[PDB]
A paper describes a structure:
Among these anoxygenic photosynthetic bacteria, green sulfur bacteria such as Chlorobium tepidum (C. tepidum, phylum Chlorobi), heliobacteria such as Heliomicrobium modesticaldum (H. modesticaldum, phylum Firmicutes), some Chloroflexi such as Candidatus Chlorohelix allophototropha (phylum Chloroflexi)8 and Acidobacteria such as Chloracidobacterium thermophilum (C. thermophilum, phylum Acidobacteria)9 have homodimeric type I RCs. Here, we solve the structures of the RC from C. thermophilum (CabRC) by single-particle cryo-electron microscopy (cryo-EM) at resolutions of 2.61 Å for a larger form (termed CabRCL) and 2.22 Å for a smaller form (termed CabRCS). In both structures, two distinctive c-type cytochromes (Cyts c) are tightly bound, making the anticipated type I RC structures with cytochromes bound be solved.
Except for the extra PscB and PscZ, CabRCL was almost the same as CabRCS. As CabRCL binds electron donor and acceptor proteins, we describe the characteristics of CabRC based primarily on CabRCL.
Author numbering:
A (entry chain a): 8 to 865
B (entry chain c): 16 to 160
C (entry chain C): 18 to 49, 58 to 218
D (entry chain g): 8 to 45
E (entry chain e), F (entry chain f), G (entry chain F), H (entry chain E): 1 to 35
Write the structure that this text describes.
């Protein structure tokens, strides 16, 4: 509490309102100037990059960015404009410009104009509260720009100034004698929600009359398109409601018109809720400590975190298959010279994971900040006499250990289940022998087709149920190995691994057929013989989301489901009967019998072709029905996978793993039960320890629990990233086209570890992304310097280094070096910067898994 | 603040035709594929009778220049429609197995470098942006199965 | 981990092959068992199973350093290339299992995103042998050292790439359980390579 | 020191270890009890 | 819409389920101090 | 469905072996420092 | 001969800029934290 | 033999080199304490 600690804590709560208000208004104005520049960065003369690409789908949907507009403009407004001083537009003049460049420049300028003015008006409230300020204090870096000192004594934002430099003439909100103004923060909740309702109404008027998207049901009967004037329902997506990439009319609320009708809906709701609160503001005793801005800061901030998580979820679904993003896949997208696989989905993934990441940070930081309010209360005596039940509901220390311990138990059980299943199935997929057990892989041999006429040597047991049976090789009467055709494989049969070409399982010798004539519930339309070893395909159904999704889809699609089932049925019967006819040919034994047989097969054949084409086309019609929750790349149903089931369990376990430190902040900011047995009392929110006593105590403060939340949460977050970008999370080494994935029509990019090496071969083909990869790795491992129990070693070595450098200064007569003292971070600041370095390392590196492309092929 | 925009540079495109942005054309599928079809066919003849006079003559000037550098058109090895020639081993772009087992990024370098014996290198004939357009046109030849 | 490895398969002899020549195959300097109880069975058995061109090859012998190793100049003589299935199998499975499985799978059906899948008939029909050499030699895609399909012109010899080319045509129309066997290579070679 | 109860877990872990190795190495070697063969 | 509603309902359901467990423990261990 | 009854037996033995072993190293690490 | 000299000059500048920058980070760390 | 002797001597000269350096620093900063 003397070093660097007073720099990132210089602006703490509570604060006066004019100071919060003006500072927010200035940030708003600054964020509008930055978006201004992003509009300039989106014009059509620039390369694709990750900024202008995250904005383009939305700019298309608004009609600002026209995808099919090539005509160059040469005059538009004021007379004669080939190019000027910076030219016809400042510096945009050497370029050829279209209408969408002008729209983009118009919107960019507005943003910059309205931003700059919001910055000024915000400084009028901010500096105006203080009586006013000087150009030299506002800007502060003008003292050392000699000359300009006569215009750095001028006072701005003053109370009685001439109009153009006034600030707040009555000094503060509370003194100004306007009765409309509300005097507390509860009271003010009402005009705030009226103001927000009005911002909605503004966006809908702009949508309707400036962007020309009327609200449903007042949509136009026709729209203008690059091919002329077209009925709304046939005009393609940016212009009308017809989705080209799914080839269907869009629901009316799936369009930007749907969005302008919701503008008016939401606006009316917010205005009415504000009118209600104008007569009935919040009042209960449970809430009146929230007038302190330090306390509401906790409520608001972790609320916004939850809002951010909810944006991620809603946005993901709503837009995973929307024509805004798919339209990027036809725009010849080139980044750092390259050509991207599926840039639509990539950009979509980046926006949703960016919201996800904001959600975690703000929830955690809101809780941390709440822990600071509560520690304050304890350390001044008034925690024990808080009156709101939102504090007092959790004061009993024994309830606090019951809450925490059962959320550890729930975390434990569900993480053990998830991770334990991942481990079981990587054992299965890798065919590992443990001596005590042999893991066995999925393997499939087609049994219909022409592949069902391929022969195999088969070792057949007689009676698996008599231990001490044994088996024999299937043979001819002549003694030589009979080749069994795949159609005649039976359950129990063993085939040599090396007759199948398998070199990856050298520890066991045979594949066992465990199921014949198998057709995947969801998968390829074929019939198979299977070794299910240890691979647990049933685990897909251990997912409550498998069942809700499939039940609702069955209900919407019941009678094509039913006909597809009857087609499969008729086909399996035809296959079986055709296999018996083929077998009578094989074993016919005398050409009279062999002609009779071949003539029977020749007569059944047309009918077996009919049943196959029937099954094929019902199974194709079934696989093109609309998705509910689990989706294709073309918004079609897919069954849930082992991957989806693992992701369900990992969300429960891993978010509880990551959030148990936050419950420790909320309950144990002053005393945990380990502290309370010793009589200890944590004296501040950020101390590093108090140890070596009792074995050592590093990491009990609230600041540290915040850092341990951030780390532990890296684990569910990376589950989310792998799952968005198409990794397979249910094992560690899944290969892209392994027999299981191929037979069950699953597309994935890798499998835990394998994903990592699989995506990085794509990452290596971009030299900007490989530079990012190198820098990312270096930031991270340096966090270890700062996080290991080693600060004393670093202090005592730094000291040797300082002595030495001062010896060199004194010897060589170099005055700048005879008093060097190297600065060595203390333990608290080492933990802060260690968490910073750990976090940023990891998440630059994750950006790369998204930036490489979306390789899921659906 | 940081990305004040983002300084990514200006986009490389093809040749300019007066009054119609070439940079823009290079991201608008119907414009880029019209130029890909011209390169692919070696003529402006299969272009929509709706094509403007200026367009039809800019393409011809493009071809005439390429004819002096001994450029060989893609059609007629591969045909006007795909799926080349088994005789010459010329690739069939209509085939779905050929299409699934190629990425568009990968396809690029096989046109740049040429491919084994007969398919010629185009690195000294065409710009990398004109190869990108052709990879996009070849994509639209795919048939099912 | 150690000692309790299994019994060795009697069909994999350890009987020794002749040593790799010191002289470069591209040299312009001077160009390019007994009767003891079981020594003849062991030599005959080594002649089918133990590979001769598996080892990385002298640096002057790599295809980028070989005067006749460029895609434009290599000789793809079909009679020499599809002459002997034992040999294609002996050599190409050792080279493939080592170098190519990582990215193309243990079944050779594709592991790394967008990777080839050699069992696909449509892919087989539309590739030449010379085409397959070009993509091994050059790599595929833009990047340093080839793209996502890496280049091999330092790394492999022209003779090693040719065993790879012939082996890869044994993948045609197989199912997704490991690699082509000796009789896959033989049915491929009988149906004209 | 070891409790009776912790000695009776260490017994269940060994019964699961030789029910696994007995069914893994017996059919490999004795060519019987074919149900568990691989 | 159906997918968005299902996903949100499942997140709030995980919270509600945790509340119910954590309150089946509190209600039935009320005679025992945790320690 | 005998593969799903067989598979499940294995998976269940895996969980007893592993979680039994984990809480076996936690009980033997308490005897080496306190009991 | 001349390429080599040109390359030595770029490498020197890089060492002057990266080591130079690193020490400035230390000095700045020093001024914040204390003196 | 030649490569073995060279390597060995290069490691032994790595230690001998360092000592000499250290000896130069000690002698030429005699009478400056390093406090
Ligand atoms: C060919 C691959 C290539 C090479 C060059 C490479 C090598 C190495 C080395 C080395 C010497 O070999 C190191 C030391 C190293 C280090 C790292 N790399 Zn690294 N690395 C590569 C590539 C990359 C890339 C692109 C990325 C990393 C990422 C990272 C990161 C990871 C930091 C970290 O702690 O991350 C924790 C999260 C992990 C490991 C991901 C787990 C994902 C999984 C799907 C989650 C769910 C499943 C589990 C069983 C879950 C538990 C259950 C529950 C609690 C949720 C650091 C800098 C990083 C990352 O994983 O971040 C989460 C990252 O994004 N790396 N990495
Ligand atoms: C919606 C209610 C608000 C909230 C409103 C208030 C108000 C008002 C008060 C507090 C107060 C407290 N809150 Mg709070 N607080 C919220 C969330 C949290 C969370 C959390 C993990 O999310 C924690 C750990 C805390 C903890 C705390 C303490 C710092 C403090 C008093 C102890 C305690 O109450 O234990 C809390 C323990 C928990 C176990 C609760 C966790 C569950 C929360 C309620 C909801 C999560 C679900 C969310 C809706 C899911 C989102 C939906 C999806 C996005 C689709 N709050 C949410 C955002 N909180 C009091 C205070 O004094 O601080 C200044 C106080 O008066
Ligand atoms: C070796 C260092 C390195 C270099 C040379 C580049 C260079 C580039 N970056 Mg990368 N970048 C790096 C490291 C690097 N970056 C690291 C560590 C991160 C994580 C913070 C990033 C994150 C990143 C993003 C998200 C983006 C880029 C982009 C760019 C490009 C335009 C940059 C620019 O406008 O600068 C001028 C701007 C500043 C100096 C700051 C403002 C350019 C190709 C953009 C691009 O699209 O390229 C494809 C882009 O969107 N950069
Ligand atoms: C990049 C990795 C890195 C570097 C360069 C260092 C550097 C050092 N460590 Mg730290 N350390 C690291 C990581 C690193 N460490 C990790 C991962 C851990 C966890 C185990 C630690 C734990 C740790 C402990 C406990 C201690 C140290 C100590 C030391 C110092 C040894 C004294 C000395 O040998 O002088 C020789 C100097 C060098 C050999 C390094 C030269 C500078 C390097 C090469 C490059 C600068 C690179 C940097 C990333 C550049 C960014 C610059 C910016 C402009 C881009 C030295 C300053 C000791 C010490 O005395 O404390 C001061 C010490 O006690 N290290
Ligand atoms: C998942 C675990 C796993 C499995 C199933 C195996 C399997 C095996 N290991 Mg590997 N090993 C592993 C992990 C594993 N190892 C780990 C973590 C290490 C690092 C210490 C090693 C280090 C290793 C070496 C150095 C060796 C092997 C060897 C072996 C083989 C003989 C095993 C043996 O003799 O056992 C009986 C073992 C015991 C009864 C324990 C003693 C066998 C294939 C040998 C082999 O040659 O492989 C081809 C061998 O030389 N192991
Ligand atoms: C390092 C360690 C900490 C981790 C190592 C984990 C690796 C082992 C984990 C699994 C162990 C399973 C125990 C063996 C077991 O019971 O499974 C086999 C079981 O069959 C029991 C019989 C026992 N008869 C009756 C023969 C004596 C046997 O295995 O021999 O059913 C199966 O075989 C399941 C078959 C799978 C699909 C059908
Ligand atoms: C490339 N192919 C992957 C995507 O394929 P597709 O779109 O077909 O299928 C899914 C499935 O649906 C879900 O996956 C819904 C969540 C279920 C909750 C399951 C139950 C959740 C309960 C957890 C409660 C935790 C509490 C108690 C701490 O695609 C998605 O929706 C995933 C994208 C969304 C991104 C994740 C959003 C954040 C995760 C939840 C945040 C939680 C926080 C508020 C803490
Ligand atoms: C009284 N002593 C103890 C109590 O006080 P106490 O510990 O807070 O004092 C610290 C400690 O010392 C360090 O913490 C070491 C830094 C030097 C290592 C030097 C090594 C740094 C290199 C690391 C880079 C690796 C990354 C890139 C992977 O307080 C701080 O340094 C606080 C951190 C603030 C630093 C701000 C950096 C911004 C400067 C950027 C612009 C400078 C130049 C560009 C002009
Ligand atoms: C695995 C490990 C544990 C085992 C270590 C192996 C040890 C092997 C010992 C290495 C033996 C080398 C001799 C062979 C050789 O040097 O070859 C001929 C060499 O003739 C000699 O000088 C002969 C004199 C050799 C008398 C030296 C005895 C060595 C002592 C070992 C001490 C080990 C310690 C204590 C660490 O030729 P030239 O250099 O002239 O020509 C270049 C060759 N192109
Ligand atoms: C080891 C030497 C080999 C052999 C013989 C082959 N490969 Fe690969 N491969 C990879 C990827 C991503 C592709 C797709 C490329 C693209 O379209 O984008 C391929 C493709 C091939 C082909 C087909 C070439 C063709 O033009 O059609 C062939 C014949 C080929 N491969 C053979 C990926 C990788 C690897 C990942 C890093 C590695 C290693 C290999 N390949 C190795 C080999
Ligand atoms: C014959 C003289 C050709 C002309 C002119 C063009 N191509 Fe070609 N191409 C030709 C053959 C014989 C082959 C087979 C290559 C081989 O494998 O041996 C091909 C191949 C292609 C492919 C597929 C490449 C791949 O990687 O798989 C493409 C995409 C292709 N060719 C495109 C192409 C284009 C765009 C051309 C004109 C610009 C073109 N080819 C000319 C024969 C000939
Ligand atoms: S090593 Fe650090 S954290 Fe641990 S007791 Fe000592 S000072 Fe505290
Ligand atoms: Ca990706």
């Amino acid at each position: 509490a003397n070093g660097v600690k007073r720099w990132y804590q210089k602006l703490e709560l509570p604060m006066p309102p004019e100071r919060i208000f003006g500072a927010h208004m200035m940030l708003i104005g600054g964020l509008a100037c930055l978006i201004g520049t992003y509009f300039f960065a989106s014009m059509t003369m620039w390369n694709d990059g990750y900024v202008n690409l995250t904005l383009r789908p939305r700019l298309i949907s608004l009609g600002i960015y026209d995808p099919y507009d090539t005509e160059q403009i040469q005059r538009v407004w004021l007379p004669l404009i080939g190019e000027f001083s910076t030219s016809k537009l400042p510096f945009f003049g050497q370029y050829p410009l279209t209408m969408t460049d002008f729209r983009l420049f118009g919107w960019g300028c507005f943003h910059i104009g309205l931003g700059l003015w919001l910055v000024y008006a915000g400084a009028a409230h901010y500096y105006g509260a203080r009586g006013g300020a000087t150009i030299g204090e506002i800007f502060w870096l003008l003292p050392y720009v000699p000359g300009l000192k006569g215009l750095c004594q001028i006072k701005w934002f003053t109370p009685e100034g001439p109009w153009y430099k006034v600030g707040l003439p009555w000094g503060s909100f509370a003194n100004t004698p306007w009765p409309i103004l509300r005097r507390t923060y509860a009271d003010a909740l009402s005009p705030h929600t009226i103001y927000i309702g009005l911002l909605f109404f503004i966006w809908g008027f702009v949508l309707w009359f400036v962007l020309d998207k009327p609200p449903v049901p007042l949509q136009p009967a026709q729209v203008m398109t690059p091919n002329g004037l077209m009925p709304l329902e046939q005009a393609p997506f940016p212009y009308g409601w017809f989705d080209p990439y799914l080839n269907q009319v869009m629901h009316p609320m799936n369009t930007i018109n749907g969005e302008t009708t919701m503008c008016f809906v939401w606006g009316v709701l917010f205005v009415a809720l504000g009118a209600y609160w104008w007569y009935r503001p919040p009042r209960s005793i449970n809430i009146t400590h929230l007038e302190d801005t330090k306390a509401v800061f906790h409520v608001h901030l972790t609320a916004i975190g939850y809002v951010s998580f909810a944006l991620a979820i809603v946005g993901f679904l709503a837009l995973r298959n929307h024509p805004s993003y798919l339209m990027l896949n036809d725009m010849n997208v080139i980044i750092y010279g390259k050509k991207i696989v599926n840039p639509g989905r990539m950009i979509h993934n980046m926006i949703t994971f960016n919201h996800v990441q904001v959600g975690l940070l703000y929830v955690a930081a809101g809780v941390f900040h709440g822990g600071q309010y509560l520690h304050g209360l304890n350390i001044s005596g008034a925690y024990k006499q808080a009156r709101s039940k939102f504090i007092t509901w959790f004061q009993n220390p024994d309830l606090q250990t019951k809450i925490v311990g059962t959320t550890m138990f729930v975390s434990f059980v569900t993480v053990v289940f998830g991770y334990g299943m991942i481990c079981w199935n990587t054992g299965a997929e890798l065919d590992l022998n443990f001596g005590i057990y042999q893991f066995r892989s999925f393997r499939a041999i087609q049994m219909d087709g022409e592949a069902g006429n391929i022969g195999y040597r088969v070792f057949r047991p007689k009676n698996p149920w008599d231990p001490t049976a044994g088996g024999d090789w299937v043979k001819n009467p002549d003694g030589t190995a009979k080749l069994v055709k795949a159609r005649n494989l039976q359950v129990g049969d063993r085939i040599l691994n090396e007759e199948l070409g398998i070199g990856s399982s050298p520890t066991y010798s045979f594949t066992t057929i465990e199921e014949i004539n198998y057709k995947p519930e969801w998968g390829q339309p074929k019939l198979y013989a299977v070794q299910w070893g240890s691979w647990t395909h049933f685990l897909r159904k251990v997912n409550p989301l498998f069942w809700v999704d499939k039940g609702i889809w069955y209900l919407q699609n019941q009678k094509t489901f039913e006909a597809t089932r009857k087609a499969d049925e008729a086909y399996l019967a035809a296959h079986l009967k055709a296999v018996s006819l083929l077998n009578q040919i094989d074993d016919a034994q005398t050409e009279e019998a062999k002609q009779k047989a071949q003539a029977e097969l020749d007569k059944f054949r047309p009918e077996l072709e009919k049943a196959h084409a029937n099954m094929l086309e019902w199974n194709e019609r079934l696989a093109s029905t609309p998705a509910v929750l689990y989706s294709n790349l073309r918004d079609q149903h897919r069954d849930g996978e082992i991957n989806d089931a693992i992701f369900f369990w990992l969300m429960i376990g891993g978010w509880l793993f990551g959030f148990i430190p936050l419950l420790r902040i909320a309950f144990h900011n002053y005393q945990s039960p380990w502290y309370r047995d010793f009589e200890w009392r944590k004296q501040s929110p950020d101390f590093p320890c108090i140890g070596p006593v009792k074995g050592g105590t590093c990491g009990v403060s609230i600041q540290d629990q915040l850092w341990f939340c951030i780390l532990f949460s890296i684990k569910p977050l990376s589950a989310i990233a792998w799952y968005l970008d198409g990794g397979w999370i249910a094992t560690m080494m899944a290969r892209g086209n392994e027999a299981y994935y191929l037979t069950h029509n699953i597309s994935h990019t890798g499998g835990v570890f394998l994903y990592m090496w699989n995506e990085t071969t794509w990452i290596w083909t971009d030299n900007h992304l490989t530079a990012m990869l190198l820098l990312g790795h270096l930031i991270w491992f340096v966090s270890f310097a700062l996080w290991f129990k080693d600060r004393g070693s670093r202090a005592e070595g730094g000291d040797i280094q300082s002595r030495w450098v001062r010896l060199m200064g004194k010897r060589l007569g170099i005055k700048t070096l005879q008093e060097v003292r190297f600065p060595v971070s203390n333990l608290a600041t080492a933990k802060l910067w260690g968490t910073v370095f750990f976090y940023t390392g990891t998440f630059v590196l994750v950006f790369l898994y998204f930036a490489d492309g979306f390789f899921q092929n659906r | 603040v940081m990305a004040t925009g983002c300084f990514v540079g200006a986009r490389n495109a093809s040749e300019p035709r007066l009054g119609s942005s070439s940079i823009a054309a290079s991201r608008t599928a119907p414009a880029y594929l019209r130029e890909a079809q011209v390169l692919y066919e070696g003529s402006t003849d299969g272009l929509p009778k709706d094509t403007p006079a200026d367009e039809i003559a800019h393409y011809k000037a493009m071809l005439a220049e390429l004819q002096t550098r001994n450029y060989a058109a893609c059609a007629g090895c591969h045909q006007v429609n795909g799926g080349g020639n088994k005789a010459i081993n010329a690739t069939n772009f209509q085939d779905a197995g050929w299409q699934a087992n190629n990425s568009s990024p990968g396809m690029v370098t096989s046109i740049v470098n040429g491919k084994g014996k007969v398919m010629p290198a185009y690195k000294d004939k065409l710009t990398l942006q004109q190869i990108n357009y052709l990879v996009e046109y070849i994509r639209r030849f795919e048939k099912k199965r | 981990g150690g000692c309790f490895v299994g019994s060795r398969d009697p069909n994999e002899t350890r009987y020794p092959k002749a040593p790799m020549p010191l002289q470069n195959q591209t040299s312009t300097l001077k160009t390019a068992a007994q009767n003891t109880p079981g020594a003849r069975e062991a030599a005959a058995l080594r002649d089918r199973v133990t590979p001769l061109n598996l080892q990385q090859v002298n640096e002057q012998d790599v295809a980028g350093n070989d005067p006749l190793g460029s895609p434009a100049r290599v000789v793809l003589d079909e009679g020499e290339m599809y002459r002997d299935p034992v040999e294609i199998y002996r050599e190409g499975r050792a080279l493939f299992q080592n170098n190519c499985v990582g990215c193309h799978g243990h079944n050779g059906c594709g592991n790394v995103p967008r990777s080839t899948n050699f069992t696909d008939p449509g892919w087989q029909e539309n590739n030449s042998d010379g085409g397959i050499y070009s993509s091994i030699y050059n790599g595929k895609g833009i990047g340093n050292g080839g793209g996502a399909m890496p280049a091999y012109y330092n790394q492999l010899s022209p003779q090693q790439i040719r065993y790879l080319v012939a082996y890869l045509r044994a993948f045609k129309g197989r199912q997704c359980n490991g690699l082509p066997t000796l009789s896959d290579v033989e049915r491929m070679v009988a149906e004209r390579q | 020191d070891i409790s009776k109860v912790a000695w009776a877990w260490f017994g269940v872990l060994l019964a699961i270890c030789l029910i696994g190795a007995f069914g893994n190495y017996v059919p490999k070697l004795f060519v019987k009890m074919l149900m568990f063969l691989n | 819409m159906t997918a968005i509603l299902l996903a949100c309902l499942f997140v709030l359901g995980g919270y509600a389920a945790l509340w119910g467990i954590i309150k089946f423990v509190v209600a039935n261990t009320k005679d025992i101090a945790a320690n | 469905m005998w593969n799903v009854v067989g598979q499940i037996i294995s998976v269940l033995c895996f969980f007893i072996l592993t979680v039994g072993t984990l809480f076996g190293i936690v009980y033997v690490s308490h005897l080496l420092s306190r009991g």
